[PDB]
């Protein structure tokens with residue numbers, strides 16, 4: 001049945017309620033960046049090397065000094081219990097099985113402690129939104145710290161929610177038996193999230209956990225994050241759900257890698273569906289990629305097992321792409337592989 005990520009999305013459309021599928025699928029406004037996140041990867045062509053000996057392809061790498069089994073990690077996607085009853089518990093168990101990391105949404109349908117309990121041995125990080133209530137915000141960080149999360153991904157591209165048209169048409173809401181368990185979405189954001197935050201707030205947040213700035217699209221902003229003692233950059237346009245008409249993340253990734261001059265790790269999300277997508281981002285300088293929507297589609301198919309399958313498909317696609325490209329490990333993936 002389901003042999004590639006696209007298949008999982010098709011299945012999901014077939015089993016999910018419309019307002020839920022649309023919430024997860026949608027981009028902002030006319031969805032130009034949504035389409036481009038995908039299309040851009042196709043414009044970067046691969047130049048494989050032959051005869052390199054690829055008999056035992058090692059996908060292992062590290063993320064902020066924590067080993068992972070592959071440079072493909074789960075990105076924050078809110079409210080996963082809308083997709084499968086088990087939601088984030090399923091996701092973290094799948095990550096534990098695979099040996100990769102999970103970035104937990106601040107707006108998760110399961111709490112920080114809950115997810116830690118379901119995936120003790122999993123590498124886990126907290127995506128943080130800066131709430132107008134800074135005591136709320138601080139408590140989220142302190143609970144992450146206590147419950148063994150290894151980094152904070154602070155989202156910096158959402159002072160307001162992007163305008164996702166289908167959510168407006170559908171009057172998007174949580175299903176009744178569900179809540180954001182650590183405590184319509186546009187209005188939520190307007191009420192709860194602080195549109196005033198600045199670089200001064202980044203200074204405030206600089207916990208001893210590593211901090212990654214999530215949502216950077218400009219080299220000058222990347223340099224500023226370095227200057228503020230952050231420990232990484234997640235090149236992200238928020239799944240094309242915030243400002244429409246920004247470039248594809250794979251197209252802005254070279255500027256940002258350049259700008260940071262190797263001082264922090266650079267990650268990418270947005271449009272990763274295939275193992276060659278992973279290869280291209282590593283070639284251009286990313287240490288690892290995050291996948292958002294594919295994980296929700298995995299949940300929609302079969303909860304933990306579905307997410308494990310989506311990650312295993314990506315792992316195998318990436319292995320094959322590495323092998324056919326002449327790469328026996330992630331350290332040998334270089335910029336001559338792409339043009």
Ligand SMILES: Cc1cc2nc3c(=O)[nH]c(=O)nc-3n(C[C@H](O)[C@H](O)[C@H](O)COP(=O)(O)O)c2cc1C
Pocket residue numbers: 023024025037075076077078105106107127155214236237238239240241269270271272290291292293294
């Ligand atoms: C349904 C959905 C929910 C998301 N929820 C969050 C969130 O709660 N916090 C956050 O920082 N980013 C969130 N994102 C953005 C993702 O972390 C990520 O940047 C995006 O999904 C990556 O693109 P992809 O879906 O093409 O893989 C969400 C994205 C989607 C599609």
